[PDB]
Design a protein around this nucleic acid. Structure first.
Ligand code: ZN
Ligand code: ZN
Ligand code: ZN
Lengths: 1177, 117, 376
RNA sequence: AAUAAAC
């Protein structure tokens, strides 16, 4: 009933890409977009893409283009959304958000021409010269946006009411030249099907409609009418040559209005299917059916085929600026793209959903190019099946934590880019040496002669010092003062001179020996930054030091006029900085509620926020702050981040440049974290496992990481409780590592585990398979993974059926002929210890056989102390065309430990197949029900009982068309059909009878089913080929259903992406489970069931958050989350919109609470309990 | 791994599982001569008498039937519950093949019915 | 006599197995996102694995222009059939002949399953429920019987004194409508068999009735020119509107599952669309039947495409938006076609002749030369 | 047993 959708992974896998002036007219920017999320990339020169902005949308981007308006200083974007929404947005300076210039709602009942089911996607195109902009709404309507108070009102041109009667549009571009903005259109007036080409030979046509903006008329010039039957995308040839190249599946054409049609074929599949006059391109057999292409310079064209192969077509040009012929060459292969952009000369971004979308570099060879691979963006691809499993090397110090310890394994990508993905959410450290040091609460590690020499501990009475080296051991001699506590210890200079400060005196040290001493109001914290030391007492007094050679620290107390008491401090320098008007800066927060940045050698005021401790979104120049830290993070310490601690609430700010003051402002970024003498909590570390950033101490620790990517990465650390203190640590037996205190007073020498990659939003190891990962299944006994994969081999035979046997027919064609793809499946066996595939353990299948399902099936047994045995069972059947009866085979496998092959410790495990028998029809899904394998053969769902050697049937019923998913719990089987429904079953066991309980009476195209679990309410979570989620319940006492026959949906929600996988895990909420899922666009979501009382305090919140906040691209967060409309019983809260209640400032946080009738402290206890309970993985 | 270890729900007593025990408002089926082949067997007739025999939406079995019928295996049984034949799947009580008793051998090798001498 | 006891040698029947296309669809589904990502099927006989069912290629609806012949399923007594409908799980084809016999044809290998003797009359109407539960069958005498999915005879009664010609029912399983040759569209209760009201004023024998899939309409044809198409109302009994569409004798009236279109076939060589929200104007017309157009079947997944029957035995496929037809079998199906029914996956088609036969049509294979006796 | 074997 009552739930909330929450998102634990932002969706990866780009789809759209361009190269425009997003920030400014000076430099250019790669602007990539995916499913409902926009990214803007700069380019550092070895080269690397650097992130510069990321934007989230309440709507999936369906097209994207950019035009530069008249007089504007930037390059606007034209975002196309679902059911005909165009949205012109721009970057904003000042605030660092997006400014939305225009919306255009175009969804009308009289535009769809009576067709309910929308199939066509909206397509934005713009002019090369930027005169207008077009959108093909619904596949039959053109919206023309005129350009030169910078817009002009649009007008809808009805396409089917023009000349030539277009009907089916394939692709449309604007052409070059052409003082009027000529729109070319591929269409088909008489549409046909590949496979029915003897009655419709070839029907594709081209109209180059010429648009008068002022007169609002449009005449057809330059028609053609007998192009080949299968034309994919058209490409506008650029300005000096003009024309258009029209890709076909088997051919390639160049078209222009003065030139006769030149067109060549590619493979010899133009024998009997096309009467268009085609030549023969020599030395070439390729196909252009999913090919992405772009123009490098002019008269050249990089074509990323399917299969990832990159060709460079040169348009061989005569003197007439006409085309003689075409020239092809086979350059380097790359990722299976979904987009393609030339950036600067020599760089090509290759945006791919499936596979890592990477950046190339090309130079000429000594016309002919060679491609080099500069950088790649990590991508969790189309997550097909993902299985929860346990890690291998969690350390013995953490071994008796009460919660489960587990991490998911995802079949990501497809094809050549097929992979497994080992995802994890928090960081589990490897502890190499522990202690128990009571009393001491603070800690510091300084560098002494670049390993760390000294570990300095402050007690409440004295001071501990430790010597490092071979064996870390406690130090006894002078230097440091152990007669009291130390407020702060740190290096000064560059790792040559050490400074500690006591609450009475201030001590240099040139190593163990003390150099000299300066005495001083309890000193509560110090700021050792670069060559300056600022020391602040408790009543608000501030002094400053400085290294001066003779080395000797010099007192220079800052000239300050204290209007109120200074509370906290920070210092910071600009290695690669933006603080314009290495330069040192002092940050200073007074008690009146203001923030003041100071230029450090002088002491003039530079930056001033008059209401600082609220938590405002963007600051500009002219309560009880605890701690404030400015640090730079990234390549060459590039971009600075403010981090403050205000009333148990972390809120961190970025910095961006913006025009006698600082030319910067600070933008607030979101979170998922709550904080519910002086001790520092924000502990900046440089070079722990190469990674730089901040550790944030508190009741929930969070590693803050920024790599050269420039993307902010928050990683929690939930094992071993809250952490009091922390320090970086580099030693001999401990490499680049770290060092913290447990709450129970246990010092732990630690190194990050080296197999993951913490640059991604979750720490992930991407395991390349170079074959399509279909399924994955953790086996608990012997602790391995079983993966069904597939490689593509060329097909060579054709099965028939002659009444007595099967007769294969050999395909025999010309040598200039591409071959159909045959897929051979094989079941791998992956080891979690080291993620190498286990050698000599691979079940390979028949010549035509396809794994349709793999699960981990608990069949009952007489061997163990329980009943269950945890087998791996795969159902698999043979695809040999429609004229051959499809039959299948149930394959039950068990992992068995043996003696290992010498030199290979991974080879102790190997499959043993108990059962492999061909069934009476296709095997489509499998399940376990109290120790009974439940299989679905055809239109019957059997239920097998495994004996010592064989499966014996017990019960069945007649089900619907193609049951493709089944999961079950406790003698209730939930099934899932391709077209019809879900059909929940039930199995009495005393009599061998299987029965139908209830079913969805509607038609519905299920991807996969799940079980929402509440205290007593068992929901039936189902996903729709429509990017939906819906929960059916069996309610017999209800009367809007019928008596125990009809299911009723109780919660509806439009997720933006398809769902195949479902995981259930109990929250860290008496008896409720979190039914997780991984969206097929690469993200991971949740469903958390809630009570009704907590629900309707947040439904009143969401209805106020939707109205009173300026969302991105002018979108409606309510209509985006309405069921299927992109009849509706909505009961799921938008937990990505409720997360924008945390982002509001606490002055604005209290206005929505008073407009809905509560206090802001209740809602923060309502929301943040939904983030505490969901801290798994 | 494998939810049954992590998301162990055997301690939960769902309302789904209670509502099928005491059957929670099953409307008696109309049109008296119906079958409803594929209905859950009732535990009310196992313990006690459920009352409305023949017009109860659940099935009633007796311990008299011996061999499976050819007709339920295709889903066509007009006789319903009052047939003399067992309706379970058990592939040991099938009828003997007619094509062995009269006409020597059988033709298809995937003949389900019992092959004896 | 065929009692099933005389042996015969084993044969592997021709099959039009839909399973290797659905499995190919479920494997593409993951890494596809639309049709705009789809790898194109290329016209050769080696690309047989790459077919996806019509759920897969959702646009390009020219897919399911089923012009490949499969099998003529005829009886042994050779009676002319009238209505043929699929079992809603696609498992088998029941067929309504002139002798009241239900010859159940198998659904993949189309051999034979069983024969019944339902009625004492030619079967004229046959509808399945909106779930898998019930099946209404009327006959030429006037009797209306309910049928379970195991083809058991359940409660019978009489609806009309004269021959019922078409049945349909509500967007729930409660309330059906039987139109007959006396001119009354009588609206029945399901569970009680209670004649709730009579829709009089048609003025001629009425020969087709369809119910609206949401709004609760009953649209009736006629054999009378002055009142050819009468909209109705199942709750009030009031004639809602009158549509003057055809010159004579509307044979079938059908409705999309979308509910925004009224398709009408008549004896004046025409099919016509009508938006039921706008009856004053008129959508496109469908010329192409050289003889009378006597049967219509909308496509289940491709909204906007429908097959069509001719009285000369012609079979034609049409699509909403195109002036000419998409492609049909002129004079190739012998006889007069009475009704058509697509499989629940819209990939195969069935037809019922005034001949004693019934032919099953599937999609064309890639790369074949369509040189057969039905196409060229 | 009620058409399991009805190219
Ligand atoms: Zn009973
Ligand atoms: Zn029986
Ligand atoms: Zn036999």
């Amino acid at each position: 009933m009552y739930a909330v959708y929450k998102q634990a992974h932002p969706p990866t896998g780009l789809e759209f890409s361009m190269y425009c002036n997003f920030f400014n007219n000076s430099e250019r920017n790669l602007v990539v977009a995916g499913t409902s999320q926009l990214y803007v990339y700069r380019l550092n020169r070895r080269e690397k893409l650097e992130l510069a902005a990321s934007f989230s949308f309440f709507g999936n981007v369906m097209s994207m283009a950019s035009v530069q308006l008249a007089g504007a200083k930037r390059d606007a974007l034209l975002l196309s959304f679902k059911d005909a929404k165009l949205s012109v947005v721009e970057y904003d300076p000042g605030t660092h958000d997006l400014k939305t210039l225009s919306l255009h709602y175009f969804e009308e009942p009289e535009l769809r021409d009576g067709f309910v089911q929308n199939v066509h996607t909206p397509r934005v195109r713009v002019d090369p010269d930027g005169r207008c902009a077009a959108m093909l709404v619904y596949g039959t309507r053109l919206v023309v946006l005129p350009f030169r108070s910078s817009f002009l009102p649009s007008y809808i041109i009805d396409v089917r009411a023009l000349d030539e009667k277009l009907l089916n549009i394939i692709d449309l571009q604007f052409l070059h030249g052409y003082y009027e903005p000529t729109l070319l259109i591929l269409f088909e007036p008489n549409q046909t099907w590949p496979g029915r080409v003897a009655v419709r030979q070839d029907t594709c046509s081209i109209v180059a409609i010429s648009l008068n903006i002022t007169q609002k008329v449009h005449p057809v010039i330059w028609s053609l009418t007998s192009l080949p039957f299968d034309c994919t995308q058209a490409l506008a040839v650029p300005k000096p040559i003009g024309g258009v190249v029209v890709f076909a599946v088997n051919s390639l054409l160049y078209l222009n209005q003065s030139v006769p049609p030149y067109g060549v074929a590619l493979n010899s599949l133009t024998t009997g299917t096309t009467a268009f006059p085609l030549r023969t391109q020599e030395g070439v057999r390729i196909t252009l059916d999913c090919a992405q292409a772009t123009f490098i310079s002019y008269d050249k064209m990089v074509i990323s085929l399917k299969g990832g192969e990159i060709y460079v077509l040169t348009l061989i040009t005569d003197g007439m600026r006409s085309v003689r012929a075409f020239h092809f060459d086979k350059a380097a292969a790359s990722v299976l793209t979904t987009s393609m952009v030339t950036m600067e000369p020599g760089y090509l971004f290759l945006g791919s959903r499936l596979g890592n979308s990477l950046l190339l570099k090309y130079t000429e060879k000594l016309a002919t190019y060679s491609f080099e691979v500069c950088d790649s963006i990590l991508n969790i691809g189309p997550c097909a099946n993902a299985a929860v499993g346990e890690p291998a090397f969690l350390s013995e110090e953490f071994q008796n934590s009460p919660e489960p310890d587990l991490e998911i394994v995802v079949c990501s990508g497809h094809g050549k880019n097929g992979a497994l993905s080992v995802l994890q959410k928090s960081i589990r450290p490897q502890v190499v040496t522990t202690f128990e040091l009571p009393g001491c609460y603070d800690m510091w590690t300084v560098i002494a002669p670049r390993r760390h020499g000294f570990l300095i501990l402050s007690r409440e009475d004295s001071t501990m010092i430790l010597q490092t080296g071979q064996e870390i051991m406690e130090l006894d001699t002078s230097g440091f003062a152990t007669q009291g506590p130390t407020v702060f210890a740190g290096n000064i200079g560059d790792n040559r001179y050490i400074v500690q400060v006591s609450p009475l005196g201030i001590r240099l040290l040139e190593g163990v020996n003390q150099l000299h001493f300066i005495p001083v109001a309890p000193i509560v914290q110090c700021a050792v930054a670069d060559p300056y030391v600022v020391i602040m007492s408790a009543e608000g007094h501030v002094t400053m030091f400085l290294l001066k050679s003779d080395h000797r620290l010099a007192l220079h107390k800052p000239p300050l006029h204290h209007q109120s008491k200074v509370i906290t401090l920070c210092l910071y320098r600009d290695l690669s900085g933006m603080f314009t008007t290495p330069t040192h800066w002092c940050l200073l927060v007074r008690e009146n509620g203001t923030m003041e940045i100071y230029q450090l050698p002088d002491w003039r005021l530079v930056f001033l926020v008059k209401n600082f401790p609220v938590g405002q979104r963007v600051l500009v120049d002219s309560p009880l702050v605890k701690e404030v830290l400015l640090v730079a993070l990234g390549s060459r310490q590039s971009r600075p981040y403010l981090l403050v601690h205000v009333d148990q609430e972390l809120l961190i700010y970025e910095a961006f440049p913006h025009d006698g003051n600082l030319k910067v402002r600070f933008k607030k970024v979101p979170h998922n974290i709550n904080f519910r003498g002086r001790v520092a909590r924000f502990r900046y570390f440089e070079d722990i496992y190469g990674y730089s950033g901040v550790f944030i101490c508190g009741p929930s620790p969070h590693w803050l990481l920024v790599t050269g990517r420039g993307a902010l990465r928050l990683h929690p650390m939930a094992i071993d409780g809250p952490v009091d203190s922390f320090a970086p640590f580099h030693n001999v037996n401990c490499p680049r590592g770290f060092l913290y205190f447990n709450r129970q007073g246990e010092l732990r020498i630690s190194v990050l585990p080296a197999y993951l990659s913490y640059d991604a939003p979750w720490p992930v190891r991407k395991i390349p398979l170079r074959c399509t990962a279909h399924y994955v299944a953790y086996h608990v006994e012997s602790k391995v993974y079983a993966v069904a994969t597939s490689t593509n081999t060329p097909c060579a035979r054709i099965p028939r059926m002659t009444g007595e046997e099967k007769e294969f027919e050999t395909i025999e064609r010309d040598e200039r002929y591409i071959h159909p793809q045959q897929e051979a499946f094989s079941i791998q066996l992956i080891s979690p210890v080291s993620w190498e595939a286990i050698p000599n353990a691979r079940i390979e299948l028949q010549e035509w056989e396809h794994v349709t399902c793999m699960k981990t099936v608990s069949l009952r047994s007489e061997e163990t102390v329980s009943g269950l045995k945890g087998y791996v069972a795969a159902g698999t059947c043979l695809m040999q065309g429609e004229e051959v009866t499809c039959r299948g085979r149930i394959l039950i496998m068990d992992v068995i430990e043996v003696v290992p092959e010498p030199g290979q410790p991974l080879t102790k495990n190997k499959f043993k197949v108990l059962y492999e028998k061909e069934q009476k029809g296709p095997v489509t899904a499998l399940c376990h029900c109290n120790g009974h394998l439940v299989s679905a053969i055809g239109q019957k769902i059997f239920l097998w009982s495994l004996r010592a050697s064989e499966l014996t049937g017990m019960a069945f019923i007649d089900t619907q068309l193609y049951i493709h998913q089944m999961i079950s719990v406790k003698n209730f089987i939930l099934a899932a059909d391709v077209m019809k429904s879900i059909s929940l079953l039930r199995y009495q066991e005393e009599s061998k009878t299987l029965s139908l309980v209830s079913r969805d009476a509607k038609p519905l195209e299920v991807y996969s089913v799940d079980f929402m679990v509440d205290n007593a309410q068992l929901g039936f979570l189902v996903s729709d080929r429509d990017r939906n989620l819906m929960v059916y319940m069996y309610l017999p006492e209800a009367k809007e259903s019928f008596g125990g026959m009809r299911l009723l949906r109780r919660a509806d929600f439009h997720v933006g992406a398809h769902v195949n996988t479902f995981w259930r895990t109990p929250c860290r909420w008496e008896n409720k489970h979190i039914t997780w899922f991984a969206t097929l666009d690469g993200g991971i979501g949740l469903l958390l069931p809630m009570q009704e009382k907590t629900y309707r305090r947040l439904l009143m919140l969401q209805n106020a958050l939707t109205t009173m906040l300026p969302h991105h691209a002018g979108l409606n967060p309510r209509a985006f989350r309405m069921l299927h409309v992109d009849n509706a019983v909505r009961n799921v809260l938008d937990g990505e919109l409720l997360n924008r209640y945390l982002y509001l400032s606490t002055m604005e946080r209290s206005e929505l609470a008073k407009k809905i009738g509560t206090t802001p402290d209740i809602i923060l206890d309502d929301l943040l309990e939904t983030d505490r309970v969901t801290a798994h993985f | 791994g494998m939810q049954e270890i992590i998301a162990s729900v055997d301690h939960i007593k769902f309302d789904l599982e209670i509502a099928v025990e005491q059957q929670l408002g099953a409307q008696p089926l109309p049109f008296p001569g119906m079958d409803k082949s594929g209905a859950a067997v009732c535990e009310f007739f196992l313990k006690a008498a459920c009352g409305k025999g023949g017009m109860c939406p659940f099935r009633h079995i007796s311990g008299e039937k011996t061999v499976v019928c050819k007709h339920w295996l295709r889903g066509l049984c007009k006789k319903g519950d009052q047939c003399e034949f067992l309706h379970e799947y058990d592939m040991t009580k099938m009828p003997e093949c007619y094509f062995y008793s009269k006409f020597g051998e059988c033709s298809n090798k995937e003949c389900p019915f019992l092959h004896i001498d | 006599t065929f009692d099933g006891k005389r042996m015969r040698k084993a044969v592997n029947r021709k099959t039009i197995d839909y399973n290797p296309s659905v499995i190919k669809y479920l494997e593409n589904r993951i890494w596809q996102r639309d049709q705009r990502d789809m790898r194109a099927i290329q016209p050769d006989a080696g690309y047989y694995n790459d077919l996806v069912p019509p759920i897969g290629m959702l646009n390009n609806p020219m897919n399911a222009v089923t012009t490949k012949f499969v099998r003529t399923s005829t009886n042994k007594v050779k009676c002319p059939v009238f209505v043929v409908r699929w079992t809603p799980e696609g498992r088998r084809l029941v067929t309504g002949a002139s002798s009241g016999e239900f010859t159940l044809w198998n659904g993949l290998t189309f051999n034979f399953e069983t024969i019944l003797q339902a009625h004492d009359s030619p079967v004229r109407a046959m509808t399945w429920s909106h779930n898998d539960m019930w099946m209404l069958t009327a006959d030429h005498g006037g009797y209306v019987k309910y049928w379970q999915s195991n083809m058991n005879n359940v409660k019978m009664f009489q609806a009309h004194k004269e021959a019922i010609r078409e049945a349909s029912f509500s967007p729930t399983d409660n309330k059906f409508a039987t139109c007959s040759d006396d001119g009354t569209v009588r609206i029945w209760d399901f569970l009680r068999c209670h004649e709730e009201r009579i829709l009089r004023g048609h003025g001629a024998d009425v020969k087709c009735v369809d119910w609206h899939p949401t709004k609760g309409l009953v649209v009736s044809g006629s054999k009378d020119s002055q009142q050819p198409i009468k909209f109705w109302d199942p709750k009030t009994g009031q004639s809602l509107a009158t549509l003057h569409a055809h010159k004579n004798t509307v044979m079938e009236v059908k409705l999309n599952l979308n509910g925004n279109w009224l398709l009408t076939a008549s004896r004046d060589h025409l099919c016509k669309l009508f938006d039921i929200r706008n009856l004053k104007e008129e959508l496109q017309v469908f010329r192409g039947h050289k003889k009378e157009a006597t049967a219509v079947a909308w496509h289940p997944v491709h909204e906007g495409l429908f097959a069509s029957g001719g009285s000369d035995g012609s079979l034609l496929f049409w699509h909403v938006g195109v002036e000419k037809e998409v492609g049909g079998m002129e004079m190739a199906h012998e006889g007069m076609i009475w009704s058509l029914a697509w499989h629940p996956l819209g990939h195969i088609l069935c037809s019922g002749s005034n001949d004693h036969t019934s032919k099953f049509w599937t999609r064309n294979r890639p790369g074949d030369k369509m040189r057969d006796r039905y196409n060229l």
